[PDB]
A paper describes a structure:
The non-heme FeII/α-ketoglutarate-dependent dioxygenase AsqJ from Aspergillus nidulans is an exceptional enzyme that activates dioxygen and stereoselectively catalyzes a C–C bond desaturation and epoxidation reaction. The active site of AsqJ forms a funnel like reaction chamber, located at the interface between antiparallel β-strands. The substrate interacts with the active site metal, which is ligated by His-211, His-134, Asp-136, as well as by the C-2 keto group and C-1 carboxylate of α-ketoglutarate (αKG), and a crystallographic water molecule in an octahedral coordination sphere.
The catalytic activities of these mutants were determined for the native substrate 1, cyclopeptine 1b, as well as for demethylcyclopeptine 1d and compared to the wild-type (wt) AsqJ by using a reverse-phase HPLC/MS-coupled activity assay, and X-ray crystallography. The wt and V72I-, V72K-, F139I-mutated AsqJ variants turned out to have similar turnover rates for the methylated substrates 1 and 1b, suggesting that these alterations do not lead to a significant decrease in the enzyme activity.
Author numbering:
A (entry chain A), B (entry chain A): 8 to 295
């Protein structure tokens, strides 16, 4: 069985989305530089350490799907300069997203999260993303272009033994799911900064951590059309942080109005014919 | 040809959604009391008068679809006490919406707007709503439950001669649109406070104002699943106004997290497993 296609962020940029459209997955080598990875890791470190279990009794939106050996930290903009500057303005990310979502219009971040898996973390069940938040997605016709995609960026090594993600190539086009098996999977073996890119229809799962010693960490960026509601809110992010961002990053975080691709688009999140940013006189690129 | 079914808000409440599901439209008689209509009208009056043309050159999200004799004012919560208290907490509205959207989960306001049509306003072309903002909707399978519905509430009389809305009954189930004609329509003749309820697949249009003297006004409330992005933003609504609302009204305006109907729903607009309202310590029902 064929392995996940591997592509250069630098040279193969126009090939990335076509590859995912065909195969349902691709590895983007050096999606983030080691410097960006180092900074992201340093900045999110304490927030990962303080994060409780996904279904902690203190939470009013517990996540009952993730294992108790998973820590997931979302709403990264207030935590990480590297995320809100380097990642949210990634030229590679934006080329891919505009390639993927042009039929629909603007896209934004549905969720940007760091996931850390403790040693001995079990494999997740094979799944498609979005089914525990956006039931609407299952009602889309089979030829509807993907309405979200997920960049699973390695922040530490992904190896067979430490639970590198499994994907089923071609499963984004499956309607009948009787052949869903771990027998059908291949692995996303990755170095820090590489990214596994999948669609919302790609069947995949986190792997089993079998060493008992290694802690695997990733940055998962679910990018989706601006017509779909994010899993996470940036409503509580301080205004000085928002005003430090680029206009593009502000839009990605829901601090701007949005547009569809409809010829005479009437817009999303507008205020009596004007944008959020015009109405609220939102500054951009103001240093902290 | 059969007329639009007319139902009592008081007595026929459980019948309203089934009627719309079958026929694509229903008139809800006395949906709003005359007192609520009077207050809404008084409160929005000046904002309608100052509103420019839909595609005014001053706007960065011009609406190129509506006629130059249309004034549309959305983001009503800061303008109208009647809207944000009486309308957003309407028992009838909420029964209907929970009937309609239970398959998907929570619902919210995609747009609440007052539309005023000047004398001599022409008929709109026959259309389905949502196509100039949410192209995703056209990609839904035919048996997907409606993901949005629109309450067109009369704030003045709707007569044949003054441009009462046209609908095509049963057109919410049409796939082939070759028989779309004004020949196929019936009229929503309504008194102030009555509401025409349609789905996002019901083919309809504003009628021609033929008197040259009458000014028709309506309150259009597009309610949709919380998985779809609103056409309008309440991000700039003052915190004291938001904190005066019920928790339900806050959710409807995007000042709360949201839930899907998925068995182990992980939520929408959450912040590291907690809600917007818990995170921001958002008060409710605090008088102004
Ligand atoms: C539930 N779930 C997440 O929490 C998740 C986490 C990170 C990024 C995307 C994401 N979206 C999802 O739909 C997944 C789905 C899932 C996960 C584990 C086991 C079964 C299903
Ligand atoms: C464009 N458009 C609005 O502006 C509108 C106004 C009020 C409530 C819903 C609404 N949604 C829409 O999709 C309509 C569609 C339309 C209107 C006129 C002519 C052609 C198409
Ligand atoms: O752990 C991984 O590599 C994948 C995680 C995942 O697919 C998910 O949580 O949705
Ligand atoms: O004017 C009316 O009665 C209907 C308006 C309408 O359908 C629209 O603007 O989408
Ligand atoms: Ni997943
Ligand atoms: Ni309409």
């Amino acid at each position: 069985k064929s392995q996940i296609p591997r592509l250069s962020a630098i040279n193969d940029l126009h090939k990335i989305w076509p590859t995912v459209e065909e195969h349902g997955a691709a590895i983007i080598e050096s999606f983030l530089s080691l410097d960006i990875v180092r900074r992201l890791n340093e900045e999110v470190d304490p927030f990962v350490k303080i994060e409780p279990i996904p279904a902690a009794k203190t939470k009013d939106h517990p996540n009952h799907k993730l294992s108790t050996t998973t820590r997931l930290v979302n709403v990264l903009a207030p935590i990480s300069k590297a995320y809100r500057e380097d990642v949210l303005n990634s030229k590679v990310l934006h080329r891919i997203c505009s390639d993927a979502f042009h039929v629909y219009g603007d896209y934004w971040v549905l969720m940007g999260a760091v996931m850390e898996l403790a040693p001995s973390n079990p494999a997740q069940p094979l799944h498609r993303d979005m089914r525990f938040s956006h039931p609407i997605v299952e009602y889309l016709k089979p030829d509807a272009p993907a309405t979200s995609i997920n960049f699973l960026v390695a922040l530490s090594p992904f190896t067979a033994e430490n639970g590198a993600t499994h994907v089923i190539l071609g499963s984004h086009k499956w309607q009948n799911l009787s052949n869903v098996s771990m027998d059908a999977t291949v692995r996303a073996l990755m170095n820090p900064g590489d990214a596994l890119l999948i669609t919302d229809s790609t069947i995949h799962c986190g792997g089993a951590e079998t060493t008992g010693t290694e802690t695997r960490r990733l940055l998962t960026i679910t990018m989706g059309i601006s017509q779909l509601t994010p899993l996470e809110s940036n409503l509580a992010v301080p205004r000085p942080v928002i005003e430090s961002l680029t206009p593009l990053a502000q839009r990605l975080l829901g601090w701007a109005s949005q547009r569809s691709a409809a010829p005479r688009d009437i817009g999303l999140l507008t205020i009596r014919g004007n944008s959020i940013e015009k109405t609220m006189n939102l500054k951009a690129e103001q240093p902290l």
